[PDB]
Amino acid sequence: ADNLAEFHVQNQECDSCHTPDGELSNDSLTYENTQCVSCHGTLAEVAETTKHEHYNAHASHFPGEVACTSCHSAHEKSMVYCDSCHSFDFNMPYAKKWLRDEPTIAELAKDKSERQAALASAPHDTVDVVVVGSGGAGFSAAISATDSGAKVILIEKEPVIGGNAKLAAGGMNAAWTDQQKAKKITDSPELMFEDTMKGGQNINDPALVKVLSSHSKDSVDWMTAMGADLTDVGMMGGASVNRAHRPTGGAGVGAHVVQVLYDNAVKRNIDLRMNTRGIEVLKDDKGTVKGILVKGMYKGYYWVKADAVILATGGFAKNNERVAKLDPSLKGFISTNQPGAVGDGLDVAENAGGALKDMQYIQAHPTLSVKGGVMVTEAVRGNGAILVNREGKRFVNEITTRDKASAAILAQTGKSAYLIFDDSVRKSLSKIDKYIGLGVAPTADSLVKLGKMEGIDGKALTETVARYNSLVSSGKDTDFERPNLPRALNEGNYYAIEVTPGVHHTMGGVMIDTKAEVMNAKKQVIPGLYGAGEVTGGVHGANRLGGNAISDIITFGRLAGEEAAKYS
Numbered sequence: 001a002d003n004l005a006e007f008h009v010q011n012q013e014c015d016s017c018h019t020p021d022g023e024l025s026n027d028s029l030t031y032e033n034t035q036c037v038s039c040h041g042t043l044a045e046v047a048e049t050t051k052h053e054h055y056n057a058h059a060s061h062f063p064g065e066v067a068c069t070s071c072h073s074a075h076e077k078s079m080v081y082c083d084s085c086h087s088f089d090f091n092m093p094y095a096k097k098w099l100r101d102e103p104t105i106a107e108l109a110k111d112k113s114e115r116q117a118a119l120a121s122a123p124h125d126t127v128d129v130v131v132v133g134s135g136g137a138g139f140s141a142a143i144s145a146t147d148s149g150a151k152v153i154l155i156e157k158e159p160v161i162g163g164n165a166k167l168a169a170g171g172m173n174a175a176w177t178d179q180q181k182a183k184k185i186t187d188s189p190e191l192m193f194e195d196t197m198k199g200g201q202n203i204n205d206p207a208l209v210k211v212l213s214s215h216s217k218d219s220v221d222w223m224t225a226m227g228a229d230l231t232d233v234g235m236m237g238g239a240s241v242n243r244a245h246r247p248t249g250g251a252g253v254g255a256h257v258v259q260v261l262y263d264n265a266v267k268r269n270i271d272l273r274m275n276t277r278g279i280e281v282l283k284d285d286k287g288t289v290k291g292i293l294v295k296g297m298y299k300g301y302y303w304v305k306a307d308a309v310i311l312a313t314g315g316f317a318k319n320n321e322r323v324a325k326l327d328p329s330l331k332g333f334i335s336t337n338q339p340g341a342v343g344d345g346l347d348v349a350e351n352a353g354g355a356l357k358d359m360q361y362i363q364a365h366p367t368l369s370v371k372g373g374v375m376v377t378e379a380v381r382g383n384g385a386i387l388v389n390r391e392g393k394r395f396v397n398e399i400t401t402r403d404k405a406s407a408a409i410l411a412q413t414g415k416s417a418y419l420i421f422d423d424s425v426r427k428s429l430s431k432i433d434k435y436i437g438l439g440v441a442p443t444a445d446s447l448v449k450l451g452k453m454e455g456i457d458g459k460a461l462t463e464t465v466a467r468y469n470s471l472v473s474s475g476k477d478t479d480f481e482r483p484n485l486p487r488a489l490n491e492g493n494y495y496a497i498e499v500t501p502g503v504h505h506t507m508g509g510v511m512i513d514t515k516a517e518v519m520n521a522k523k524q525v526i527p528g529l530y531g532a533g534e535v536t537g538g539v540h541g542a543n544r545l546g547g548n549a550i551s552d553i554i555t556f557g558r559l560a561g562e563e564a565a566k567y568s
């Protein structure tokens with residue numbers, strides 16, 4: 001057969017998959033997916049049948065309950081979502097090459113011509129608040145608004161939840177938390193503010209950063225009350241003390257936080273709609289929002305009547321064309337992001353009259369795995385790893401800010417470097433075992449063998465580590481002034497990961513005030529319109545600190561949800 005449906009109808013009726021009337025249930029394809037599960041079992045049950053030693057299409061790091069139709073279409077060939085960042089050896093029936101070519105908001109003007117008819121119709125739903133995007137900002141806002149008495153609809157344009165937030169590794173910054181105190185760490189919201197302002201070249205909006213620093217503990221407390229583990233607290237670049245919180249053992253913060261938000265959303269019966277793209281904010285005759293029209297992938301255009309809309313759509317770091325127009329030094333770089341992170345929500349915001357700011361400030365993560373084409377967490381460095389070049393030498397303070405680290409690596413021979421660490425560092429951060437399972441962390445019982453394996457001068461490598469270990473014991477890095485020297489690299493075997501910068505985060509975005517209200521170029525608030533998370537600009541200035549984006553999206557997501565509800 002040429003497609004999955006044709007396969008099944010060889011021995012099945014249409015209503016094995018469909019509703020009696022044959023209409024698709026909704027854009028999440030709830031009923032239909034329910035039918036696949038009825039015959040094949042849950043995604044976990046399918047997973048038992050498709051294991052490989054180091055990977056499994058049906059048991060991944062994605063949180064939430066991933067719908068079968070995310071990858072398995074019925075009446076046409078479909079794409080494996082994992083192929084958007086990896087190239088695993090898969091044999092999905094009826095597969096086609098991964099290719100993402102979502103139309104822009106501007107191109108969707110080719111649907112006047114569908115859109116006019118929708119807007120002429122009754123609104124499909126009438127609620128209080130509509131939140132766009134199921135990343136951390138969006139779930140936080142949806143939950144926050146719901147607890148504040150508002151009826152919400154949460155929409156996600158992708159087939160799966162979580163956006164980039166589900167990918168987060170290194171942690172969530174906050175000061176001065178109960179969790180830090182339990183780990184004997186001394187910190188303050190003032191210190192966090194100062195690290196943050198300096199890290200961003202004092203470009204950041206000080207009122208927004210004040211909100212980030214002062215609400216950070218509350219945000220950790222809120223997530224914890226909802227069931228999250230934020231008890232491990234690590235170091236990230238440009239911070240005066242350890243303040244990046246994540247699950248026990250040093251597991252990734254991202255999938256965990258989104259899973260917790262998802263669970264809490266489902267607990268409150270929040271209306272979550274997948275494959276549903278926010279297209280244009282609707283405003284009444286006095287310019288306040290009155291709703292939003294959306295495009296369901298399976299059921300087409302419709303609008304939702306509401307007093308408020310919260311845009312929580314993430315950044316545009318996956319869109320290299322737009323990035324390179326803003327910062328040509330990043331043209332052609334690989335990105336760390338999910339395939340939908342291309343900035344269409346910003347278009348939505350601008351079309352609704354919101355102004356943008358700081359857009360030229362785009363952050364490259366200094367360590368994308370060259371071999372895997374995926375982000376390798378900064379916590380690897382925070383927990384003690386060093387960087388060496390092909391000459392087997394250190395060349396930079398590995399916990400400096402990302403602008404400086406990226407430039408340093410790009411200035412080394414071959415425009416890449418190697419993370420080097422031992423088993424003590426490996427055991428201190430369980431997320432590192434994920435890089436090993438991905439096959440991107442070759443290992444050996446001596447630095448000479450490792451260097452010969454990876455094309456690093458082996459003798460130089462050895463002396464570099466011996467010398468670095470001596471600075472660790474002396475307590476002072478006189479070579480590159482790295483301010484925190486947490487571990488000597490001397491336990492067990494040695495690992496190398498080849499790394500180079502990848503485009504990661506867009507610090508610019510829609511202009512918001514401290515209540516997360518979106519503003520126009522005259523600095524006037526657009527009543528009913530809110531923005532939270534990486535879609536906004538002004539929080540992180542010219543360079544964002546590792547750990548500060550998850551802090552941002554919880555704090556500003558929650559704040560937007562409560563402001564939205566109050567606005568009502």
Ligand SMILES: Cc1cc2nc3c(=O)[nH]c(=O)nc-3n(C[C@H](O)[C@H](O)[C@H](O)COP(=O)(O)OP(=O)(O)OC[C@H]3O[C@@H](n4cnc5c(N)ncnc54)[C@H](O)[C@@H]3O)c2cc1C
Binds near residue numbers: 173277553
């Ligand atoms: C690999 C990786 C690791 C990171 N780790 C860390 C970390 O450890 N600590 C840290 O502080 N930061 C980290 N960052 C950054 C942080 O995760 C992101 O800044 C965060 O994802 C921004 O969250 P958000 O809620 O604003 O957006 P996202 O989580 O990206 O969610 C936005 C969602 O909106 C959807 N969307 C967009 N437009 C539309 C639309 N028009 N209609 C409907 N849906 C829409 C998107 O598909 C997406 O699912 C990491 C980023 C990546 C990529």
Ligand code: HEC
Binds near residue numbers: 024069073075
């Ligand atoms: C389950 C394995 C399926 C069987 C067998 C059939 N259909 Fe289906 N259909 C299914 C899904 C999940 C969807 C969504 C799109 C996709 O291809 O994945 C569909 C959709 C259609 C549609 C489109 C309806 C619309 O766009 O509004 C129609 C017209 C349709 N299917 C009809 C249909 C008939 C007549 C079938 C029996 C011969 C049949 N489908 C089987 C899943 C499955």
Ligand code: HEC
Binds near residue numbers: 012037068
């Ligand atoms: C029960 C009534 C089923 C429903 C509803 C769906 N599937 Fe199914 N599927 C079923 C059978 C009995 C078989 C044959 C193998 C077996 O388990 O006995 C299949 C086969 C598939 C396959 C493989 C097709 C191929 O070319 O080999 C896949 C990938 C599969 N089915 C997917 C799938 C999805 C995603 C469903 C819903 C959209 C779905 N199936 C419904 C039985 C049933």
Ligand code: HEC
Binds near residue numbers: 040046049069080089
């Ligand atoms: C993408 C992220 C997927 C989602 C979501 C689901 N499936 Fe899948 N499926 C996917 C791949 C890449 C493959 C191949 C596995 C491999 O290791 O090569 C498959 C395969 C199937 C099959 C065939 C299994 C077999 O008997 O060999 C079935 C029956 C199947 N998938 C079912 C299925 C169902 C019902 C889903 C939802 C619960 C589902 N898959 C999710 C990728 C993806």
Ligand code: HEC
Binds near residue numbers: 056061084434
């Ligand atoms: C890009 C946005 C990604 C997509 C889409 C998928 N994964 Fe991923 N994967 C991602 C990263 C950044 C990493 C590095 C390690 C980490 O936890 O951050 C990985 C790694 C894996 C691995 C290795 C570790 C492990 O969990 O076993 C596997 C086997 C893996 N990813 C599988 C996987 C599957 C099956 C996906 C589709 C559902 C999937 N990934 C998509 C980034 C990205």
Ligand SMILES: O=C([O-])[C@H](O)C=C([O-])O
Binds near residue numbers: 169379548549
């Ligand atoms: O390196 C990390 O884990 C990460 O990528 C952290 C931030 O904030 O973006």
Ligand code: NA
Binds near residue numbers: 315507
């Ligand atoms: Na931004």
